[PDB]
Each structure stands twice: as C-alpha cells, then as structure tokens.
Amino acid sequence: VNSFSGYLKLTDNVYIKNADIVEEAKKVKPTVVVNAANVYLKHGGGVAGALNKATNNAMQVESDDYIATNGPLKVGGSCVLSGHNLAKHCLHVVGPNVNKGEDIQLLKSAYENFNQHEVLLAPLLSAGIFGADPIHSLRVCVDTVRTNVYLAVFDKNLYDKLVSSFL
Ligand SMILES: O=C(O)[C@]1(F)CN(c2ncnc3[nH]c4cc(F)ccc4c23)CC12CCC2
C-alpha cells in the first residue's frame, strides 16, 4: 500500500491521473519524482521549469553544480539528485526532444531508467514541449517500465484521450 490516490490503473504496474505533478509531489512527498530534463539540466520550461520553480530555484542551483562537475547527461540517460521540498529524490531523465531532431527510439532507453526505482511519480517522457506523441510515449512506458509508475498528466483533455485510446 502507498499513498497515491485517484489514479486509474492501466496495467499491473502503471497508473495514470489528471494532475499537476508539482501539486501531486507536494502532497504525496514520493520517494522519487521524475523530471523531464534536458542534457544540460537547464530547467526553463515545461515540467522542468515548473518543478524547479516550486523549489525556489534550488533544483537549478544543485543542477548547475552537478553539470560543472560531471558534464552533460546523455539523451536517454538520467541522474539522481535531491527532491528538495517535493520528494526525497528527483530522477532527472532526458527523453529525446523531437523539436531538436533527436531519435525517438531513445525514448525506450529513457524509460529504462525508471526500472532502477521501485515506485515513481512521473510525467510522460518526451511529451509536452519535447514534441513527441503522448500516446506513443504512454505505449513505450507501459512496454518498458516494470516498476510501479504513477503518471501525472497536466492536461485534462489529453488525459481523457490517453485513457480512451489505451489498448
Ligand atoms: O514540458 C513539457 O513538454 C510537458 F508537456 C509538461 N508536462 C507536465 N506533466 C505533468 N505535470 C505538469 N505540471 C506542469 C506545470 C507547468 F507549468 C508546465 C508543465 C507541467 C506538467 C509533461 C511534459 C514534460 C514531458 C512532456
């Protein structure tokens, strides 16, 4: 038993809710919240900009130190940093950005990072401003992640479409 509430169950291990991931994280304080990061951990907009804003920019300060020490992430890669006031940990995961021409096959590699964590609160990778089809992203998530994932979808219209088209 865990504290996630109001989710629709899609599969044995994947759940979905129309929710603002920032507000969901603030209430649940999950062990892991996933950020839709870029390789530079520049949290300007989308999910990343919203998560970072909710931390009063502490996520960005920590991220800049991480990059100064380690250099950029790989597309499809991840790093674990603090969850600040939102979660114990933040798993920063880089899905491919279609608006940068990155290979969509890397979306599966991105979701594989989730398997290193037993339970996660997450957005759909490569959705939103990353330009991928969220229905495809949901399919890859279901077919790749084996650990327990609670997907927060900000847009109600999109959430209803994801549920109604789910196979
Ligand atoms: O940034 C993108 O492209 C996204 F569409 C944004 N998404 C979100 N998902 C779940 N809760 C969210 N709260 C927010 C508050 C905001 F001000 C802005 C975006 C969100 C948001 C998923 C996405 C990241 C991969 C695709």
Curated annotation (Swiss-Prot):
Classify the protein's membrane topology as the record does. Answer: Multi-pass membrane protein
Q: How is its activity regulated?
A: Inhibited in vitro by GRL-0617.
Where does it localize? Host endoplasmic reticulum membrane
What's this protein's function? Responsible for the cleavages located at the N-terminus of the replicase polyprotein. Participates together with nsp4 in the assembly of virally-induced cytoplasmic double-membrane vesicles necessary for viral replication. Antagonizes innate immune induction of type I interferon by blocking the phosphorylation, dimerization and subsequent nuclear translocation of host IRF3. Also prevents host NF-kappa-B signaling. In addition, PL-PRO possesses a deubiquitinating/deISGylating activity and processes both 'Lys-48'- and 'Lys-63'-linked polyubiquitin chains from cellular substrates.
Q: How would you summarize the oligomeric state and partners of this protein?
A: May form homohexamers. Interacts with N protein.
Tell me the domain of life: Viruses
Q: Please list the reactions this protein catalyses.
A: Thiol-dependent hydrolysis of ester, thioester, amide, peptide and isopeptide bonds formed by the C-terminal Gly of ubiquitin (a 76-residue protein attached to proteins as an intracellular targeting signal)
The UniProt record lists the Macro domain at: 1-167
Q: Which gene encodes it?
A: rep
Q: What is this protein called?
A: Papain-like protease nsp3
